[PDB]
Symmetry: C5
Subunit: 30 residues, 5 copies
């Protein structure tokens, strides 16, 4: 269904956000 | 329906957040 | 019901997060 | 009420995220 | 089912995001 597919898209985007924030956190530690 | 459309709006805002985070990560590396 | 209203609240909080990240991105660029 | 409880948890975590980002934005000003 | 499981995964990823943002905030506050 459309709702289940949209939720899978949201989950995938959140995993990208989680990854980018870990990159940022490491950059801030030098 | 309203719930499906609200989820699509959530997905779109998350893509904007993910792109701004990539811009921040790039700014921190110069 | 409560599910539709909570989704609307989530969408609003994400718009706030998106705008605070734009503020952060701008401050880091000076 | 499992769906409603999970959405309320997501909403609560997003409020925490929004406040931590406002704290970050304040620190970087600064 | 699938929708309930996807929402639980979204909740878990948001908790990870919230933790990494607390680490970022602490690094920037020294």
């Amino acid at each position: 269904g459309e709702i289940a597919q949209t939720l899978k898209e949201i989950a995938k985007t959140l995993k990208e956000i989680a990854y980018t924030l870990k990159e940022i956190a490491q950059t801030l530690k030098g």
